[PDB]
Amino acid sequence: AFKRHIDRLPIIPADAKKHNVTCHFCIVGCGYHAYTWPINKQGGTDPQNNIFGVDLSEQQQAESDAWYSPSMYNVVKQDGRDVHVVIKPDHECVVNSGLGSVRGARMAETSFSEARNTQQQRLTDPLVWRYGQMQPTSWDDALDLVARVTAKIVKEKGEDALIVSAFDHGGAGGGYENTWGTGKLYFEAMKVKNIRIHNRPAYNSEVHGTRDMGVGELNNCYEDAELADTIVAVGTNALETQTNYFLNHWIPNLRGESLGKKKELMPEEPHEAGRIIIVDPRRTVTVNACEQTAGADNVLHLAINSGTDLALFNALFTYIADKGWVDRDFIDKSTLREGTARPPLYPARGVSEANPGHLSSFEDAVEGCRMSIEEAAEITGLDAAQIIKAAEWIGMPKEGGKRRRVMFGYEKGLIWGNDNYRTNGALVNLALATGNIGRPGGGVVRLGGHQEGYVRPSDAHVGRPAAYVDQLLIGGQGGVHHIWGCDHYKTTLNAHEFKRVYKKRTDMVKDAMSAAPYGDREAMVNAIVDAINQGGLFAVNVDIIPTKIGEACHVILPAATSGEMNLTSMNGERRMRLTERYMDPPGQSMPDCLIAARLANTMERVLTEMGDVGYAAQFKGFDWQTEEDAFMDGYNKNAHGGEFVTYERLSAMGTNGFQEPATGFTDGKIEGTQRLYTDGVFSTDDGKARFMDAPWRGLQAPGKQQQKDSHKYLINNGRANVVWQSAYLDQENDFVMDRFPYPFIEMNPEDMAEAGLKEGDLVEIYNDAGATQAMAYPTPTARRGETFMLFGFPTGVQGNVTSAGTNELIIPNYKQTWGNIRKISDAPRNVAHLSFKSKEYQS
Amino acid sequence: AFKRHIDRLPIIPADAKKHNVTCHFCIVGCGYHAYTWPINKQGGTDPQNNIFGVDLSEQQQAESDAWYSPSMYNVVKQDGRDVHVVIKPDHECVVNSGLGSVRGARMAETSFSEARNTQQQRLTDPLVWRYGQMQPTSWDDALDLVARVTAKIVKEKGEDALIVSAFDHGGAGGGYENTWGTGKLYFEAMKVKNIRIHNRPAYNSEVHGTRDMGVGELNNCYEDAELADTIVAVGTNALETQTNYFLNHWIPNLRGESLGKKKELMPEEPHEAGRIIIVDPRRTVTVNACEQTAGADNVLHLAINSGTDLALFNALFTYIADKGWVDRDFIDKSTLREGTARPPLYPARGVSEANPGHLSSFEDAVEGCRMSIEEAAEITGLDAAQIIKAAEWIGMPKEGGKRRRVMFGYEKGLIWGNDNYRTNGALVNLALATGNIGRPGGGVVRLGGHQEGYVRPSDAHVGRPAAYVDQLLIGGQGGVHHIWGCDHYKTTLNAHEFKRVYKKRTDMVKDAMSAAPYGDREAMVNAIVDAINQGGLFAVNVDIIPTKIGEACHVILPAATSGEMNLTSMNGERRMRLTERYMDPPGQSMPDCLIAARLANTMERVLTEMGDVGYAAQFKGFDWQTEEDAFMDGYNKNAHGGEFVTYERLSAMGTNGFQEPATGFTDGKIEGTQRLYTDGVFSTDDGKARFMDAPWRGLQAPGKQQQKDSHKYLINNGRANVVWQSAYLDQENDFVMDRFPYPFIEMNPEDMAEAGLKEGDLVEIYNDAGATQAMAYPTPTARRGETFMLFGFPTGVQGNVTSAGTNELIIPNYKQTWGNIRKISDAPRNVAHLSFKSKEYQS
Amino acid sequence: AAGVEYPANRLANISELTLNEPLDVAYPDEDAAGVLLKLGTRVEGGVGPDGDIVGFSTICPHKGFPLSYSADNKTFNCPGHFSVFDPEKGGQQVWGQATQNLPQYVLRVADNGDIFAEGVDELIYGRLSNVL
Ligand SMILES: Nc1nc2c(c(=O)[nH]1)N[C@H]1C(S)=C(S)[C@@H](COP(=O)(O)OP(=O)(O)OC[C@H]3O[C@@H](n4cnc5c(=O)[nH]c(N)nc54)[C@H](O)[C@@H]3O)O[C@H]1N2
Ligand SMILES: Nc1nc2c(c(=O)[nH]1)N[C@H]1C(S)=C(S)[C@@H](COP(=O)(O)OP(=O)(O)OC[C@H]3O[C@@H](n4cnc5c(=O)[nH]c(N)nc54)[C@H](O)[C@@H]3O)O[C@H]1N2
Ligand SMILES: Nc1nc2c(c(=O)[nH]1)N[C@H]1C(S)=C(S)[C@@H](COP(=O)(O)OP(=O)(O)OC[C@H]3O[C@@H](n4cnc5c(=O)[nH]c(N)nc54)[C@H](O)[C@@H]3O)O[C@H]1N2
Ligand SMILES: Nc1nc2c(c(=O)[nH]1)N[C@H]1C(S)=C(S)[C@@H](COP(=O)(O)OP(=O)(O)OC[C@H]3O[C@@H](n4cnc5c(=O)[nH]c(N)nc54)[C@H](O)[C@@H]3O)O[C@H]1N2
Ligand code: F3S
Ligand code: F3S
Ligand code: FES
Ligand SMILES: [Mo+4]
Ligand SMILES: [Mo+4]
Ligand SMILES: [O]
Ligand SMILES: [O]
């Protein structure tokens, strides 16, 4: 097991500088502080000599604010000088209450340090493909080349020849400054249609369903998870994927800690310890934790068949409506009453590709979705009794016939799950019918992935459905690709075919650049455009590390991330915070919004020189010199309630910040919105929510049923607790890579015995889409024929065996994947040190 | 300026484990010790508690043994535990006398550490190209793939289809164990013709010239540099490139420190302080150091024109002969007296490509070489009075008619210089004529590059001249390439064209392997061979880091280097030492010799399965389980005097070891050879040295005169004192990369001003062969029209502008390169922090 | 106890410094020879109103040879093995056998112009702890 052998840390001195830091990583947005002090200085054991005011010569007891781990300590550049830094979870943040996940708590250790030699992989310099390999160069030179090629191609073949892949998320690698910078460049100055997002291959929403129904997907507050009678958790592994929301808010509900608060905030109705329904085909550590804290009797794990959520939801909606277990008053006053005619091709297909489901009244949706317990048990594989109990835990009035309070949280098991649009609607149906939107203990919400920090111009030119960007590239279309803060080689669908063709097209342009003289920049640009005109691709990567897709790119621009820049973003309850810059960018690396600005400056200059003064003028309005200029040109001017928000005010609010939208500023406090839709006015023209007439139609994406029937195992996929995303930082972190040097594939031990596999064995997963590798991890809780592979991993990409298959709105159905498994090799030697024991906690 | 901010190092305890370590790096082979102790123990400041028996609470004075810098300290794995390690120069080693260079003093911080995060680039696992990128795998899997593709291709197309690039040098990435293991696989088990060496594109000697004459190139000891009357240093920058040989042995001579030892060892003649001739077109820090320690009076810097050494030497030879400043008895007793007829094609060409120079008597050579002082002055651009004075400093007798003692030293200014075979010969003529071989104060020697550690089966099958391997590869020949411990992408000649074609050919095999099923190995193998048959190349890289040529390779195998293994090598004195293992290989990396044995064992199995037991049996004799097995099978059985040398005996003799060849073993002491040719019997069938009839014939390599005539600047090239070789370790060492993030090109300030160039500017050097980049470094001492570019550097490869031009024996003529210089961009911001002052020390 | 505890020692006054003339100093004790130096230009680590006052250990980090200043090039020069250090660029080894750039002092200028050393950025020659 990897041990740091750091048996002593510098003590934070009492005059250390404090910065407010939101966690870089997941949706929960746990609060932290960065304490920096000069190298050559330290605090002392005595109370007046340390930031804690505490005698550090004494053992601290459990949950002490007066400790930190090695992973929280480092040395970084601040204003050109080496400083000590501790990045430490904030005890007074209501989000986390001093909790740090295995991810946030290693923010420090995953910061760039020359002095302590952490994350030396970090990009410090622009790189260009010339003289037979990648070569470092100046910003002026690299931007000039990107500008000249991008300008020539757009001018000869139109903006449709420019392909963009960019984050749209918050936190490190997004936020309001960065999305606005990128957004303004490609949507204001240009009208790029052929743009995709970090996690899906078109410019679409994850959740058009809930939005079309007029319910924004982040409509509750984290306290609602404390106040609910029942949590409904669909396609979420929250202990692993929303750790500190689960631990600091769901848990207190389940072991009865929130009872006092419930009785105080909601007197005149009964209250008992929260119960939880988990809809997930896989038994996760979350199911285990729930059983362990609430007792097995207060946990209903619906281990559905993969891709059968919609059947379950329709059946619950049907049962709940027939019983009259609904909020009549909420339905009559806040939802659409005027019935509406089913489209011609219903139920199999919606009216168009744009609108897969039928928006309607309560009564119409009940009749359209209508499904019996008997039918849903057959489809889902559940007992009738499990579906009835679930309807009871969701809908049955409490003693005195008081409405049951239910929080419905979903994530990627639904969103990357079967029939995204109708399944999303079917769940919202359940929350609308039970009046569990806009009220204490309620909500129908995305539990989320990244934090949120989206503000951009109109995207109306993109269309709906939007262009399937991967299929464009794979089919030889487009001339220039700008990639920002995503790595399709590890994370796109159909990733094997994607890499095969992406390598070929970028190689054509690499070969041309290697044979052309660079010193005559006009000859170079000509060779590149001539190769593009033969079906080649010129590819520009903006990132913080050498990416997998970067191995195929011609130009690489180094970015600075959260903590090396100021950054704004909101969490899963819309809690906006400012991360206050505590360190310098590594080398000449610069914030994404400013790279966007600098590139717009270069496009303007280059388009002037080419003649076209009209097109050149479109790249004006990018004179930003700090990220705060992006914030003020973007969020402040364009966000709902933006007028009330500045860095200075956000700073004052600290790691508790405020819940968007901001309603006012008064007495040095931004005034926020604790919950959306409390007045029962929804985000439609006429202010009523729509229900969804959303009948089950089996597996909806093309080839999916064929793939299931022709392959032996379900290749379920998703997150590990230890790993952050595509392991872009974790790959140079000995703590993580010591645990999983290969991606695990969780396999039933009987399934392993039958296939001749032992723990640690390198296996190939193969199907119609492609092939990949993983390390076999015996998992007693795995159902026979069902495996789970860690997604996005550099040493075995699960994406390689996902099909091109999407729903009508180009939503990648990653979770419904089936494949075969055969041994490549006996357990490699580098895996002998691994624990293969159960991840499930035991009493 | 990069600062470590390490205020304090652990004290080596009294009971630390001691290991004899020779420097990993240059020929000099400075003695060190590695002290290791448990991570949870340390030494005390009191004498009884540290390794020095000294009170460390008190400041130590200049040249203290009881100090070590931060770069000499790390934490490393030993028998699977973290230990402290200090790698310190041995004060008691006769080579260095406790000196460590800027290179050897950072052995510890260029070691692999998980705990202190040093050299995380180091390879831990076998990598195979599959699923669209490089993927870690098992040894068994990787070796099976390499062997199945190798066995199939040599079975189908012959051994001539297997191409090999491999180290032939000593120290780290070489040595007796590793040259033997690779040599036995490719020359015993097989008869590989199409093999090149790490620094030259055929299987040839750097110095056929001296060797054909019967003078092995390492014939003296380091003491002779202390005892010479004159040192003649030809195309050596010894202060940068042979640092502690210069500092610990040349300096004492030039300063008179040596006078006492001279008088004790050679009474019966006069002795003044040593003088020095430096033949180098460029004024180095070596010229400066010599002036500053012996005064300008005692230093003759002959700033010859590029590649005219042969003219200078023929004129010195002529002048010395005509004066009778020659050892008449040596010539008559120890050299060839028999006249022999010039070849028909003389003097333009030799008797063949194989023999470009004519071996003869003293008198035939003088008449052949015959050149006037006037003519050499024309060619060299020296003044007559410089050449005449150089003659006097070499030839003219001392007071009592006594012989002047002259050590003649050369390296890559000659060897990579014009007409390698003849220039090498012309220099040996001078040392032969003056009886300066096999006497105290004498020698005509390579000053060296790496340490030496060569033992291999016969290479008779390879031929002379041998195959120009790079031209075979560029011309689309060969199927499989095994690359061991070299990186042609940074260090070969004609490197731009090499990379253009190497990428296309390996790309063809990559596309095939991305498109084929891996888990079915036979189909993977057939897709590879079909791609090879279309003109592809399958490439295997054996290295310690991800190389530049490794970005084109299909299999990477991870090697363990010196210190992670026992390693034997000898210095430029033939001083053989054992480097004793002090640490563990990173991850699963294994010594090169054991990789060769494992590949041999796999070749045996694969060939047996294909049903060729006869070919399979050739791959026996590779049952080695440790590097010592390779030493005993190789050096012990095959080296001259090998039967006297074992690890145990070598260990007992410490960092002073013994000079090869070993003559016997007497009470715990291997007896060695201080000097070669002391009995005047040379390495020829009859025991006579031959002189060389070596007439000047201009720039002899094809296209060189054309390249001089058609380009504005000389692109001289070679070493920086800070940089070790191709910066394979240095590129992840902040100290080195802080100094030169770009390779410097030394340019005259007047030349820079005329070209609109300022300090730091990024410039393209381009010519007929290709193009590359460097950072302009203003150098007052540089002659106008004459630049010097750091070689082998990842961030700008000088090799790109070197032509394919070799001499008749396929020696690469790197140093005679001319190209044009244009600006790429203004000084990048990452050079702003650089010092641009003179490297020349000022009194 | 985790870090080295550096004394805040008085070295000189800003008034004691002549442009380009090293003032010989000891920090962090008597046996750690160094200099203060005004450079007449704004540079890395520089203090005082012009930001041109720097402090360096002046014992070669290679083998402990006392260094010597060249006023013409503004470089420390080692007569031991010919190392050159640039105190205009943070004491970068311009050429040399040290594995360290020249250990440099953390200077603070108080109101009266008294100059203080609070630490060193590299390991001083001949001590395994900067504070002994
Ligand atoms: N530790 C860690 N946390 C993270 C991240 C990370 O990389 N590591 N990344 C963040 C990001 S960007 C995101 S998007 C979120 C994702 O957070 P989650 O969506 O919670 O995580 P996943 O592992 O993608 O999938 C959750 C569950 O979906 C289940 N599932 C699979 N197929 C189906 C199906 O058909 N129906 C249902 N109902 N469930 C199904 C899986 O069994 C799995 O347990 O996590 C965020 N947090
Ligand atoms: N099979 C399967 N595939 C999936 C999923 C799944 O469940 N199953 N999940 C999908 C989901 S939900 C997601 S979120 C995606 C993730 O897909 P990606 O976005 O490709 O994955 P990340 O690892 O988050 O990629 C972030 C990249 O941005 C870089 N980066 C970090 N900080 C910065 C910064 O400040 N600026 C810039 N310019 N770059 C920065 C990182 O180094 C990294 O290369 O994967 C998707 N893929
Ligand atoms: N223009 C020009 N070109 C030149 C020269 C010149 O003067 N001018 N000089 C030439 C000369 S003299 C030389 S020596 C060559 C050098 O040419 P190369 O040999 O290509 O250069 P090195 O950097 O020594 O390469 C050593 C390689 O071996 C790897 N390595 C190190 N240790 C081990 C080990 O234990 N095992 C294995 N398997 N690999 C290991 C390193 O990671 C690195 O990739 O360059 C030549 N090229
Ligand atoms: N610091 C350091 N030391 C090293 C190495 C390293 O990488 N770094 N590598 C080692 C190795 S493998 C080697 S081979 C040696 C190389 O050691 P050297 O050969 O001493 O070094 P180079 O810098 O290659 O070239 C020596 C000199 O040749 C001169 N020269 C150029 N053209 C001519 C010419 O036509 N005639 C003459 N007479 N001189 C000419 C150059 O100006 C240069 O000063 O260094 C070894 N030691
Ligand atoms: S620490 Fe960070 S990763 Fe998520 S659970 Fe808290 S925000
Ligand atoms: S320390 Fe090493 S690099 Fe050469 S000069 Fe001595 S062997
Ligand atoms: S002590 Fe200064 S260079 Fe050796
Ligand atoms: Mo996500
Ligand atoms: Mo060499
Ligand atoms: O996401
Ligand atoms: O060499």
Tab-separated table of C-alpha atoms in Angstrom, chain A residues 2-8 39-40 77 82 112-118 120 124-126 129-141 489-490 495-496 499-500 503-504 507 510-511 513-521 548 551 588 590 598 732 734 738 741-742 762-765 771-773 793-797 800 822-830, chain B residues 2-8 39-40 75 77 82 113-118 120 124-126 129-141 489-490 495-496 499-500 503-504 507 510-511 513-521 548 551 588 590 732 734 738 741-742 762-765 771-773 793-797 800 822-831:
chain	number	residue	atom	x	y	z
A	2	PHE	CA	1.306	3.518	-0.897
A	3	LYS	CA	2.548	5.404	2.234
A	4	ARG	CA	3.813	9.036	2.015
A	5	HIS	CA	6.081	8.663	5.142
A	6	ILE	CA	5.263	12.349	5.976
A	7	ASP	CA	5.090	12.038	9.819
A	8	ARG	CA	5.076	15.855	10.467
A	39	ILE	CA	8.380	29.822	3.069
A	40	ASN	CA	10.957	30.216	5.953
A	77	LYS	CA	4.079	29.878	-6.189
A	82	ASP	CA	7.113	29.880	-2.847
A	112	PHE	CA	1.486	22.159	-9.231
A	113	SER	CA	4.618	22.303	-6.952
A	114	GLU	CA	8.208	22.684	-8.396
A	115	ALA	CA	9.506	22.603	-4.779
A	116	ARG	CA	7.544	19.414	-3.757
A	117	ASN	CA	7.466	17.972	-7.375
A	118	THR	CA	3.637	17.458	-7.561
A	120	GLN	CA	4.931	18.074	-13.089
A	124	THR	CA	3.595	25.335	-18.766
A	125	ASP	CA	4.007	26.346	-22.482
A	126	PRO	CA	2.138	26.482	-25.834
A	129	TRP	CA	3.689	20.105	-34.123
A	130	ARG	CA	6.826	21.052	-36.163
A	131	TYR	CA	10.203	19.415	-37.053
A	132	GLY	CA	8.774	15.886	-36.444
A	133	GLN	CA	7.382	16.282	-32.854
A	134	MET	CA	5.579	18.727	-30.489
A	135	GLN	CA	7.775	21.785	-29.733
A	136	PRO	CA	7.288	24.531	-27.112
A	137	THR	CA	6.740	28.080	-28.529
A	138	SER	CA	5.382	31.557	-27.562
A	139	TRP	CA	1.678	32.509	-27.139
A	140	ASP	CA	2.083	35.015	-30.075
A	141	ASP	CA	3.324	32.235	-32.474
A	489	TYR	CA	-10.285	9.520	-26.329
A	490	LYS	CA	-11.262	8.534	-22.710
A	495	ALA	CA	-14.604	5.746	-28.585
A	496	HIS	CA	-12.743	2.936	-30.467
A	499	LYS	CA	-9.825	7.228	-32.095
A	500	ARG	CA	-9.269	5.034	-35.238
A	503	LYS	CA	-5.781	9.456	-35.571
A	504	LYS	CA	-5.999	8.999	-39.430
A	507	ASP	CA	-1.984	12.209	-39.093
A	510	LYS	CA	0.821	16.068	-39.067
A	511	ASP	CA	2.574	14.583	-42.183
A	513	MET	CA	3.254	20.054	-41.308
A	514	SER	CA	6.439	17.855	-41.028
A	515	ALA	CA	7.238	18.246	-44.819
A	516	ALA	CA	6.478	22.057	-44.951
A	517	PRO	CA	8.771	24.936	-43.835
A	518	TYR	CA	7.484	26.600	-40.573
A	519	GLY	CA	9.728	29.753	-40.883
A	520	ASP	CA	7.545	30.677	-43.930
A	521	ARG	CA	4.259	30.646	-41.869
A	548	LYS	CA	-4.993	11.444	-24.709
A	551	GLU	CA	-1.516	13.016	-28.728
A	588	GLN	CA	2.923	30.765	-19.002
A	590	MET	CA	-3.542	31.252	-18.613
A	598	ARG	CA	-6.462	36.342	-26.700
A	732	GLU	CA	0.227	11.449	-11.463
A	734	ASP	CA	0.560	7.602	-6.249
A	738	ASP	CA	-1.510	2.477	-6.135
A	741	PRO	CA	-3.423	1.011	-11.758
A	742	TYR	CA	-6.029	-0.584	-14.143
A	762	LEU	CA	-6.348	-8.467	-17.318
A	763	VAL	CA	-9.532	-9.105	-19.403
A	764	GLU	CA	-10.644	-7.808	-22.823
A	765	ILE	CA	-14.240	-6.493	-23.046
A	771	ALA	CA	-12.699	-3.618	-27.461
A	772	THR	CA	-10.921	-2.550	-24.234
A	773	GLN	CA	-9.197	-3.883	-21.086
A	793	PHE	CA	-9.874	5.562	-17.279
A	794	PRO	CA	-6.549	6.057	-19.131
A	795	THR	CA	-5.285	2.392	-18.710
A	796	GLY	CA	-8.585	0.905	-20.084
A	797	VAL	CA	-11.308	3.076	-21.723
A	800	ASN	CA	-14.493	1.792	-26.526
A	822	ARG	CA	-12.007	-12.998	-22.296
A	823	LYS	CA	-8.637	-13.105	-20.475
A	824	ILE	CA	-5.687	-11.145	-22.010
A	825	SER	CA	-3.202	-12.088	-19.241
A	826	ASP	CA	-2.926	-13.558	-15.703
A	827	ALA	CA	-2.954	-10.837	-12.958
A	828	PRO	CA	0.000	-8.542	-13.811
A	829	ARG	CA	2.746	-8.226	-11.125
A	830	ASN	CA	1.840	-4.458	-10.573
B	2	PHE	CA	14.999	27.592	-9.439
B	3	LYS	CA	15.410	27.151	-5.624
B	4	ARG	CA	14.580	23.834	-3.826
B	5	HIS	CA	13.867	25.597	-0.437
B	6	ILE	CA	15.388	22.530	1.317
B	7	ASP	CA	16.779	24.227	4.486
B	8	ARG	CA	17.909	20.930	6.068
B	39	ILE	CA	13.119	5.997	6.777
B	40	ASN	CA	12.270	6.180	10.550
B	75	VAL	CA	14.127	8.514	-0.486
B	77	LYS	CA	12.721	1.678	-2.384
B	82	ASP	CA	11.504	3.312	1.722
B	113	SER	CA	11.028	8.375	-5.654
B	114	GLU	CA	7.286	7.851	-4.917
B	115	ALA	CA	7.863	9.558	-1.474
B	116	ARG	CA	9.625	12.730	-2.866
B	117	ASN	CA	7.987	12.589	-6.376
B	118	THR	CA	11.267	12.416	-8.424
B	120	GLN	CA	7.597	9.879	-12.089
B	124	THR	CA	6.929	0.933	-14.485
B	125	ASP	CA	5.001	-1.429	-16.860
B	126	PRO	CA	5.114	-2.955	-20.347
B	129	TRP	CA	-0.495	-0.135	-28.675
B	130	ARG	CA	-4.120	-1.458	-28.605
B	131	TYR	CA	-7.683	-0.076	-28.309
B	132	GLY	CA	-6.395	3.185	-29.996
B	133	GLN	CA	-3.600	4.218	-27.539
B	134	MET	CA	-0.699	2.825	-25.425
B	135	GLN	CA	-2.024	0.453	-22.710
B	136	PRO	CA	-0.162	-1.122	-19.762
B	137	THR	CA	0.036	-4.929	-19.879
B	138	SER	CA	1.942	-7.892	-18.358
B	139	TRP	CA	5.510	-8.931	-19.288
B	140	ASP	CA	4.207	-12.348	-20.492
B	141	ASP	CA	1.681	-10.618	-22.847
B	489	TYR	CA	14.381	11.241	-32.884
B	490	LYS	CA	16.722	13.562	-30.848
B	495	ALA	CA	16.834	13.433	-38.048
B	496	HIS	CA	14.043	15.468	-39.784
B	499	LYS	CA	11.141	11.248	-38.279
B	500	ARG	CA	9.020	12.063	-41.435
B	503	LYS	CA	6.140	8.159	-38.357
B	504	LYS	CA	4.481	7.137	-41.701
B	507	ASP	CA	1.530	4.702	-38.376
B	510	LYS	CA	-0.696	1.340	-35.625
B	511	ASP	CA	-3.807	1.758	-37.887
B	513	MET	CA	-3.502	-2.927	-34.797
B	514	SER	CA	-6.301	-0.392	-33.854
B	515	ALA	CA	-8.592	-2.098	-36.476
B	516	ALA	CA	-7.848	-5.772	-35.471
B	517	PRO	CA	-8.967	-7.945	-32.492
B	518	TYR	CA	-6.247	-8.048	-29.724
B	519	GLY	CA	-7.806	-10.787	-27.467
B	520	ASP	CA	-7.356	-13.110	-30.511
B	521	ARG	CA	-3.524	-12.756	-30.705
B	548	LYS	CA	10.491	10.592	-28.514
B	551	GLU	CA	5.792	7.855	-29.530
B	588	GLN	CA	8.142	-4.090	-12.869
B	590	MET	CA	14.026	-5.191	-15.315
B	732	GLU	CA	12.014	16.311	-15.390
B	734	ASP	CA	13.655	21.776	-12.598
B	738	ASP	CA	15.111	26.264	-15.275
B	741	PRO	CA	14.027	25.329	-21.291
B	742	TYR	CA	15.134	25.727	-24.961
B	762	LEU	CA	13.278	31.613	-30.781
B	763	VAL	CA	15.006	31.013	-34.178
B	764	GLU	CA	14.535	28.406	-36.956
B	765	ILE	CA	17.830	26.865	-38.241
B	771	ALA	CA	14.686	22.610	-39.954
B	772	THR	CA	14.706	22.969	-36.117
B	773	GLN	CA	14.466	25.653	-33.386
B	793	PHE	CA	17.675	18.425	-26.892
B	794	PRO	CA	13.926	17.560	-26.707
B	795	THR	CA	12.730	21.214	-27.100
B	796	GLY	CA	14.844	21.729	-30.288
B	797	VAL	CA	16.717	18.875	-32.083
B	800	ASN	CA	17.234	17.901	-38.000
B	822	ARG	CA	15.450	33.248	-39.297
B	823	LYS	CA	13.249	34.420	-36.359
B	824	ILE	CA	10.201	32.269	-35.315
B	825	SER	CA	9.029	34.566	-32.443
B	826	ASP	CA	10.303	37.133	-29.860
B	827	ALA	CA	11.849	35.731	-26.626
B	828	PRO	CA	9.093	33.564	-25.078
B	829	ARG	CA	8.065	34.831	-21.580
B	830	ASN	CA	9.529	31.568	-20.037
B	831	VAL	CA	13.112	32.769	-21.024
